[PDB]
Design a binder for this molecule. Structure first.
Ligand SMILES: *Cc1cc2c(cc1C)nc1c(=O)[nH]c(=O)nc-1n2C[C@H](O)[C@H](O)[C@H](O)COP(=O)(O)OP(=O)(O)OC[C@H]1O[C@@H](n2cnc3c(N)ncnc32)[C@H](O)[C@@H]1O
Ligand SMILES: *Cc1cc2c(cc1C)nc1c(=O)[nH]c(=O)nc-1n2C[C@H](O)[C@H](O)[C@H](O)COP(=O)(O)OP(=O)(O)OC[C@H]1O[C@@H](n2cnc3c(N)ncnc32)[C@H](O)[C@@H]1O
Lengths: 577, 577, 52, 104
């Protein structure tokens, strides 16, 4: 390890890896640090669900997720345990116990908010849904020129889709997928469009999908190497980045202070360019620990010297959820083209169809799968093949339905009663609302309480704003009830519900982008550069200043691409020495 | 990939790594196959708990364990869900759903039995407890010479302990450890001895313990490499080993048929020596797939040609559990040597002791940690330092208390109301009973139903034997109730209970060792060689033929060491060319 | 059930359970105010909660 | 088979039932409020020894029924509250409210 680089990147999630991909490829000497460690197999930072075991038993993958999500802010616990033995040591107060945050108002929290500290960040476990934002949800990159703005966004999103290997085709021949898609298409004909969820994934076989991740964007291997003999990159895991050192003029960062967690050593690392991609919460912690914004409980009587909007205007999406059990009518429709003779398990049992019949409701590939399932598995009462892929349906955010929708299956921990229902019948419904940015919604950092890495403890002060956000959230719930009914009734134990605030992990606006620091109440400009500083850039969902419903990573990646274009025009790589 | 080796090993858990360490080191050309994949970071097969994040957040590790335990046999689900919507498809029968095994009697199962398919096997998550068995629990290696038998076991265990880096000193300066140790020592003075649980682990700092794994035993790196230029080893992950081929005389194995899960290709691999270390369930499965034992539901009318005891006499331990909340008397005792002047929070607060005073109940190191905690954290009501390591206490199995004991903390999922209790107060109690081997307790494989890898589905027929086993299990429960009360009352939500059968994962005896195939009802001899076959050896807990309460892996390793001694004396490594 | 139907709790402390999955449109508390016949005098950790 | 073991609790002056001067109950009467913990010393030791005794004795009969494992009940669920208007020979010396004729 040198202490001198052209570019230093804090964090190895997909957004840091966007910076690495662009800047390593452009010839910069790059170092990347992550507080977490390498633990996705030989492909560094890869999706953990791309093992044969998890493709065979997807529900177990919920545990992988849970095991790498650490709650950001947990209030002091006030549960009464009054059945202890009289001999056991008993509390007289609800004292600060077990990592709880006494700063945190339990009634103004994002209780579900959590962070992941592993190489690859949250892209080692994410669901991979990468929709574009429509104009209503999307920050402006060009002012007073809609065409130029659209053009810029299409250019950036197309590149981002390439980096993630986004596609809308991986589930095209699923029977469950089409059953759901076709029914919703028909039900909302002339009203709403449905399509496959855009997914950062590549199908490798009928039973394996290679989900994308940080590793897809940038393989995280040190360079130079045989495949890349003229590139320069080093990844340093288990290194906590603690602060960036400002010059007196607040015009330049002079070094990055790091703490190696294995050796315990501390260094100052020098670079021409500093990029913070530690996530929406930890970029904010790093900046506040460096003297940006205000440390401690918000105090408007003493406004901060630097970045006064840092950690205000925070947004998190409302999320409603249920599961359904497919209707009888839809199930019977799967075998609508079949002629059935005999009795199952007898020798005379026959299931046949006439391919190409114009009276056929389904195509030949569908009927062939159904026929074979029914003929080969006569004990089984359902027409859906055992290995049929899950549905992956969406109707994207629109003005008349201002929520993102996913109608699909992701890893789930079914209760024992629920495991009573055949998985082929079950469809998950997740509708995500947009949240108005408001100055009063904040993420701040304790001046006394510290987290597990001895950094200022994050504290939320959050409520879903009154007005449009709240009206929309409840309308969204109702829409999920209405739409889901078209497919089947609710699954007991997965009834329609709001999820705990933040469990969605789509936190935005903590270090938000705008054209003008003061007028747009923001922290970075449209190049992701921190106002006032020549050589400091932030990447991630924290940049996003708007109310959005759709999943934000693709949009954050697009912003990072643009940021890299600025860097390439304003800083010269060292000659390869 | 060539298809010719001196030794092939099926499975990369700690027992396959014992064979690798021995035989790679002795100059043999070795191949090792695992159906699972590399996923512990750069140290192949290492303990997954050895990350900074899991050592700061230990309770999250339960998720890692759960994510890689797949249930062996799940009976058909008969839960009634009668609150479905009338439009939803609903069952008329409890049909075979969601991977359930219709062969399984739900009332004669080991419902907690599970397997792990990852490089390093279960050693990537295990608790690292490595006690020796006393004579009572241990199979004979020498007949009619107790002293010779003791001497051989001492030699073997000592080598195993070196491979695992077993020690009893890693928690010596924990306050909680010694608080518990000293109390129990006093309460049972002259009756039972207490010590630290022997642990396969190396402390690296006050806050980090490097837990041992398969990687500790053998690093699993392909050889030749720079550090081992004259050794020969290859590891092949994501390879399902399906069968060994027998010759017509049933005297030699001729090849191992494998299925590469990534390419889909099948191959016949040739070696001089074949070692099956796939675990107690999957060794049995591979053998039955290869014509050993009997496929299908046990039929005593129809005698197996080979290894008629295979999959009979299976043993699993009874396990009782509770947690306690430390007594007020013990907690006050921590600060017995302190003089406390003034009021916490004030200028005048003072906590002092007299170093080396002969009336001190505790050593200086103890008093200094207590003093500093109380003086530096005056808000905290407990005398135990925040980073004090957990207890790791045992009284080992004896005739008058025929159970293994662990009084400790390991990864645990606390409900929100239990999260209300300060973690420093909590102690876990796990007592493990011995189970008598009975011919009627069986692991068998279906001739119709298949598992996720298209192999004959495992099925248990198991009950804890009447008589000694059952009496001891219940005595063990009462013992735990009596002993734990000396430390504190039970923690609500963790009351004394038997764990589901097999959840312990200490299954033995599926391919048991003995001197004589017929007389000792067994499958391998004391070199772990399958009877009648020159070149087939089994390693693992499946070999252990006795009733044991202590954790078996160290014992299984010792048997593997002895097995390798036989292989080295009876097979010649190929010349290195 | 007969028994439970005629036992009324003597002293119930103020409830501090966090319900954070309300709809945004539902009326939501800013404090754990005195609700549902709870007794604000009662230290929840020095009670006979089962007394009825 | 159900197992219920009941301990004795030492009377202590600090263990009180009192009534709010502001809060009222369903009958518009002063709200009862407890200030109670099981005393240290004998009471606490005995309660835990009692638990152990139940574990040991019940084992003679059968193992625990899952879902009904050995536990303390919530304080006062027993409904055997005493001593709120306690008897003795002398008001002051015996710290009491009624005499042995139950007369105030
Ligand atoms: C968890 C999750 C996330 C997820 C999702 C489902 C689950 C269960 N589904 C999504 C989906 O379908 N579509 C979508 O767009 N996003 C979805 N996500 C969220 C997504 O994973 C994140 O938006 C994304 O990964 C954010 O990327 P970014 O690169 O900005 O941040 P990160 O992945 O959190 O990585 C940050 C890294 O930085 C490190 N770190 C943190 N603090 C420090 C310090 N002080 N020093 C050095 N490194 C630091 C982390 O360890 C981390 O790896
Ligand atoms: C899960 C667990 C285990 C555990 C423990 C706590 C938990 C939560 N605590 C223990 C402890 O404190 N002390 C102890 O002695 N044991 C403890 N354990 C159990 C222990 O981990 C096991 O006894 C041990 O790992 C067994 O070792 P072995 O090497 O015999 O087997 P394995 O670890 O199960 O690995 C076997 C491998 O073989 C592979 N495999 C299986 N089938 C195939 C086929 N067909 N082809 C190729 N490979 C195959 C597996 O994938 C696996 O990796």
């Amino acid at each position: 390890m040198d202490i001198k680089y052209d570019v230093v990147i804090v964090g190895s999630g997909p957004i840091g890896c966007t910076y690495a991909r662009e800047l390593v490829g452009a010839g910069y000497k790059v170092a990347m640090f992550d507080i977490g460690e390498i633990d996705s197999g030989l492909k560094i930072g890869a999706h953990k669900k791309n093992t044969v075991e998890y493709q065979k038993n997807i529900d177990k993958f919920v545990n992988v997720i849970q095991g790498q999500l650490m709650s950001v802010s947990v209030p002091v616990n006030t549960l009464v345990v009054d059945t202890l033995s009289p001999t056991s040591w008993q509390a007289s107060t609800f004292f600060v116990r077990n990592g709880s945050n006494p700063e945190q108002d339990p009634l103004r929290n994002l209780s579900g908010q959590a962070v992941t500290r592993v190489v690859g960040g949250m892209s080692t476990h994410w669901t991979c849904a990468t929709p574009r934002f429509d104009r209503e949800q999307r920050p402006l990159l060009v002012k007073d020129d809609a065409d130029a703005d659209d053009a810029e966004w299409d250019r950036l999103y197309t590149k981002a889709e390439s980096y993630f290997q986004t596609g809308t085709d991986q589930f095209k021949e699923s029977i469950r997928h089409n059953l759901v898609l076709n029914k919703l298409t028909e039900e909302y004909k002339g009203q709403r469009d449905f399509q496959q969820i855009p997914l950062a994934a590549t199908r490798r076989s009928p039973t394996f999908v290679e989900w994308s991740s940080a590793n897809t964007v940038f393989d995280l291997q040190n360079r130079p190497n045989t495949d890349a003999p003229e590139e320069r990159f080093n990844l340093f895991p288990a290194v906590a980045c603690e602060r960036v050192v400002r010059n007196a003029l607040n015009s330049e960062i002079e070094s990055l202070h790091i703490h190696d967690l294995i050796s315990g050593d501390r260094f100052e690392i020098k670079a021409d360019v500093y990029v913070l991609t530690a996530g929406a919460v930890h970029n904010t912690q790093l900046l506040v620990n460096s003297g940006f914004g205000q440390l401690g409980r918000p105090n408007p009587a003493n406004p901060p010297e630097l970045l006064p909007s840092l950690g205000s205007y925070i947004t998190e999406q409302s999320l409603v959820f249920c599961q359904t059990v497919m209707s009888t009518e839809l199930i019977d429709s799967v075998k609508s083209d079949m002629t059935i003779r005999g009795t199952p398990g007898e020798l005379t049992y026959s299931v046949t169809y006439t391919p190409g019949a114009s009276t056929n409701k389904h195509p030949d590939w569908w009927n062939e799968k159904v026929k074979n399932h029914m003929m080969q598995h006569q004990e089984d009462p359902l027409p859906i093949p055992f290995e049929d892929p899950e549905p992956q349906v969406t109707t994207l955010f629109q003005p008349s339905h201002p929520w993102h929708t996913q109608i699909h299956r992701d890893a789930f921990s079914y209760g024992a009663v629920q495991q009573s229902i055949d998985s082929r019948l079950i469809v998950d419904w997740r509708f995500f609302g947009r949240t108005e940015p408001k100055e009063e919604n904040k993420l701040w950092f304790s001046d006394k309480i510290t987290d597990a890495y001895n950094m200022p403890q994050p504290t939320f002060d959050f409520r879903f704003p009154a007005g449009r956000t709240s009206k929309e959230a409840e309308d969204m719930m109702t829409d999920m009830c209405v739409m889901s009914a078209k497919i089947g009734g609710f699954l007991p134990g997965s009834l329609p519900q709001f999820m705990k605030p933040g469990l969605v992990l789509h936190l935005g606006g903590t270090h938000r982008m705008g054209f003008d620091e003061k007028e747009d109440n923001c922290c970075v400009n449209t190049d992701s550069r921190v106002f006032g500083f020549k050589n400091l850039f932030l990447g991630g969902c924290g940049n996003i200043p708007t109310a959005y419903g759709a999943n934000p990573t693709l949009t954050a990646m697009s912003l990072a691409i643009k940021s890299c274009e600025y860097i390439k025009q304003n800083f010269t790589p060292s000659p390869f020495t």
